[PDB]
């Protein structure tokens, strides 16, 4: 038997599910067919409505204490929770029921970890990260908007293979991928050290791959794996394609000033 997994969605854009399906190794196909039992997932499952409600209830009952809960998105506390409605009731009710039976929770993305765009000023819905609502369960934060595909799949394979949760930092992020800053492993650091900066888009510096610090790069304050693991089967990352890091793996990055203002 494969380990049961329940994947639920609060307020979210679905970037985290989309990132997951981009995994190159293992393919998401192979994760679903061979590594886990993805037993509930609104984006992909056949059942709808009452049939989907039956799946949810059956799984969390049969596998009480034994399933992993993956959470994408977050609960809004405004309007009695009815900014996010599932089966006619506040999403937070579904979150709390799913959490109660879980052995552990994976908070995918900056939404579930910290709040992400809906929690940016002035947070109209009172969107709230998972760990401020669920306070009696192990929560692994895997931040990023979205996290890197092959990071998501590596964390999953670690847990399956090694039968344990990843070691985490003081914020609940896996040390393996979040222990160092973007700027600690950035291939443009030679230029940063030399004072060789892009000053305006498409200037001569930009065409030579100079450092993006003066264009607002938030790599110096951001912990993630983008500058080493890279994105989309190692093809690129934001800085390699010419835009500074936005800071998207960090709590509150939307409200830390303009993306084009220097750290």
């Amino acid at each position: 038997p494969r380990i049961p997994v329940v994947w639920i969605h609060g307020l979210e854009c679905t970037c985290c599910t989309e990132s997951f399906i981009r995994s190159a190794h293992p393919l998401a196909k192979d994760v679903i067919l061979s590594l886990i039992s993805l037993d509930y997932d609104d984006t992909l499952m056949a059942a709808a409505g009452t049939q989907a409600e039956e799946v949810f209830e059956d799984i969390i009952t049969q596998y009480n204490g034994k399933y992993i809960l993956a959470v994408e998105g977050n609960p809004p506390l405004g309007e009695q929770g009815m900014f996010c409605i599932s089966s006619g009731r506040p999403f937070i009710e579904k979150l709390k029921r799913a959490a109660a039976g879980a052995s552990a929770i994976i908070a995918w993305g900056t939404c579930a970890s910290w709040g992400c765009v809906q929690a940016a000023r002035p947070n109209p819905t009172q969107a709230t990260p998972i760990d401020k609502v669920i306070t009696d369960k192990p929560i692994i934060k895997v931040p990023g908007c979205p996290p890197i595909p092959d990071v998501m799949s590596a964390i999953i394979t670690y847990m399956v293979t090694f039968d344990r949760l990843p070691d985490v930092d003081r914020m609940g992020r896996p040390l393996m991928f979040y222990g160092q800053r973007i700027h600690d492993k950035c291939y443009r650091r030679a230029h940063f050290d030399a004072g060789e900066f892009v000053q305006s888009w498409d200037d001569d510096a930009a065409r030579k791959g100079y450092c993006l610090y003066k264009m607002g790069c938030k790599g110096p304050t951001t912990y993630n794996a983008c500058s080493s693991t890279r994105w989309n089967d190692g093809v690129s990352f934001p800085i390699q394609s010419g835009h500074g890091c936005l800071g998207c793996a960090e709590n509150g990055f939307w409200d830390r000033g303009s993306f084009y203002s220097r750290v």
């Binding site: 854009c13 984006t43 009695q80 900014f83 992400c116 765009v117 498409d202 010419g242 998207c248």
Partner: protein
């Protein structure tokens, strides 16, 4: 119970009420309710968006140069399209013209998204409405091979391959851990494919799930990452260097070689896997050419997209045509103006928002996003909706109208607009397709037609990828490398007060962003998104939107198993995070 007439329909909420909440195999959160009569035919349909985040509110006070990054996060499925509409809007407000290569690259980004999004929709979202996955276990692998080889030149067709797929599925199911297939609608009488077609289709589902990850490598080259690539106001940040020192730090010939390789593979997959599968769905499900017409024979809308002349959004530039048809008059395709206050307006009399006067519609430059959760009597409580009250407010989605008309947007709308404007390629394609199915042209205005049009648009976009790539290379051979205009990057160069509109055709239909800038900051930012149109609630005249209309008059075989509802809703490719933003 009450009944009234609108748009040729009799809206009757007598009879049994059915609820489908959650709608799955969509993006985001939706609830649908219907009433059925004694013949199990839908006589009332209610579309409800069950989420809201408030990006229009969050964007206030931001620097316009940052806006794209925020609004990109409206949606990770249609990822990039909102960034594109944002940079368009801000450039329109300030008066910025981008260089030709930036426009070409943006067009590549959009075409890449069309290919990716349409492919994943066809297989991962809509496919299980048409393919009975469990029935694939009954297939003969040799007959499956013969079927596949009769439909396509695609290489992967051996009997051994189909046996291996079937065996993997058997072993997946055998321990009772059915995963995403648990408690599905398998065996419903509306599943009409033979077992061999179900196994072929399921094999292709898995091939598409693997292959889709490759398409977005184009976004990673030009935009850094997918989901959610990066953009700039003034062009793109992916500076080009082909033949100078430091090309290792830029888009160079090796990077462009990677892009070309992806384009070729993408076109091959779409043309030889998705296109024959879509035509086969049509061949085996012809009655669905008469189901789910809705507003597609009444009122359809496109803004147009893919400006081929940089900074020119007019009819001679846009490669994907714009226009509107109303009152079923396809002989008169009307021009669309997104500044005209009498054209696009949004109503909230049936939505969870406050206007000073909810009986009037507001153009987006006059838009207001003041959330007000107020469901009235829902046969439960405010935190327990048993039955939405469609006589009152019932959705987080605003109701857009065009000159007061309820419109359908998306692939079928676009196809009808292009066909009736006399686009020769569209006319030839559509006519050849309907001839091959032995169906009349009217058969396209249906649930089945939506699926066919989506597949043909994926083919169109894959072709346009090569066209745009070749355009970029032509410029590079001529020594034209520019990717950004920065004359008006600094806020001291901007008008003190200005406004602009950015528009395009997202995978799901007509998208617009309306932006007003004052004193260097966003003063107003209003979005009207394709699923906002299609999933719209009612207006003060009681007019229904595209989803509600397409569900009307539909027969259900088994009321408790809402496969017909799912088929029609999925044919629009609902994106609920987009619809509500």
């Amino acid at each position: 119970s009450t009944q009234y007439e609108t748009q040729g329909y009799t809206i009757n909420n007598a009879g049994r009420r059915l609820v489908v909440d959650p709608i799955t195999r969509i993006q985001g959160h939706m609830r649908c309710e219907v009433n059925i009569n004694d013949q199990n035919v839908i006589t009332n349909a209610v579309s409800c968006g069950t989420m809201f985040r408030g990006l229009e509110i969050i964007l206030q006070g931001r620097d316009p140069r940052d806006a794209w990054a925020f609004v990109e996060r409206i949606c990770g499925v249609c990822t990039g399209v909102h960034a594109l509409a944002s940079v368009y809007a801000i450039e329109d407000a300030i008066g910025i013209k981008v260089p030709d290569n930036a426009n070409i690259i943006r067009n590549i980004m959009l075409a890449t998204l069309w290919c990716h999004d349409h492919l994943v929709h066809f297989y991962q979202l809509a496919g299980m409405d048409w393919i009975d996955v469990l029935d694939a276990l009954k297939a003969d692998p040799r007959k499956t091979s013969e079927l596949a080889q009769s439909l396509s030149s695609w290489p992967k067709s051996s009997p051994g391959y189909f046996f291996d797929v079937q065996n993997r599925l058997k072993k997946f199911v055998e321990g009772g851990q059915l995963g995403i297939f648990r408690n599905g609608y398998w065996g419903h009488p509306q599943y009409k494919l033979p077992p061999e077609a179900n196994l072929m289709g399921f094999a292709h589902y898995l091939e598409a799930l693997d292959f889709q990850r490759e398409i977005v490598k184009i976004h990673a080259v030009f935009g850094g990452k997918n989901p959610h690539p990066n953009w700039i106001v003034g062009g793109m940040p992916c500076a080009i260097n082909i033949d100078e020192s430091g090309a290792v730090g830029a888009v160079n010939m090796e990077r462009l070689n990677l892009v070309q390789s992806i384009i070729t593979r993408t076109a091959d997959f779409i043309n030889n896997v998705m296109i024959p599968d879509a035509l086969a769905i049509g061949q085996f499900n012809k009655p669905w050419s008469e189901i789910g017409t809705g507003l597609s024979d009444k009122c359809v809308l496109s803004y147009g997209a893919f400006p081929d002349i940089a900074n020119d959004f007019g009819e001679k530039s846009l490669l994907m045509p714009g226009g509107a048809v109303i009152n079923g008059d396809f002989n008169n395709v009307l021009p669309v103006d997104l500044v005209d206050p009498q054209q696009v307006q949004e109503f909230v009399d049936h939505a969870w928002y406050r206007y000073p006067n909810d009986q009037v519609g507001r153009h987006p430059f006059d838009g207001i996003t003041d959330p007000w959760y107020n469901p009235g009597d829902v046969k439960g409580s405010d935190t327990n909706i048993q039955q939405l009250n469609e006589q009152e407010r019932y959705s987080w989605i605003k109701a857009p109208r065009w000159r007061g008309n309820a419109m359908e947007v998306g692939p079928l709308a676009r196809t009808l607009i292009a066909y009736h404007k006399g686009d020769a390629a569209t006319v030839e394609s559509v006519d050849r397709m309907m001839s091959a199915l032995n169906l009349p042209l009217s058969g396209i205005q249906s649930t089945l037609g939506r699926i066919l049009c989506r597949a043909h648009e994926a083919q169109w976009a894959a072709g346009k990828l090569q066209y745009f790539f070749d355009k970029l290379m032509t410029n590079l051979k001529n020594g034209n490398l520019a990717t950004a205009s920065t004359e008006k990057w600094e806020p001291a160069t901007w008008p003190t007060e200005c406004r602009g509109v950015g528009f395009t055709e997202a995978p799901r239909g007509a998208l617009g962003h309306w932006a007003a800038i004052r004193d260097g900051k966003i003063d107003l930012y209003q979005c009207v998104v394709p699923t906002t149109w299609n999933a719209s609630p009612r207006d003060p005249k009681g007019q229904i939107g595209a989803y509600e209309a397409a569900l009307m008059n539909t027969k259900m075989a088994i009321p408790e198993q809402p496969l017909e509802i799912l088929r029609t809703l999925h044919s629009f490719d609902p994106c609920l995070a987009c619809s509500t933003h």
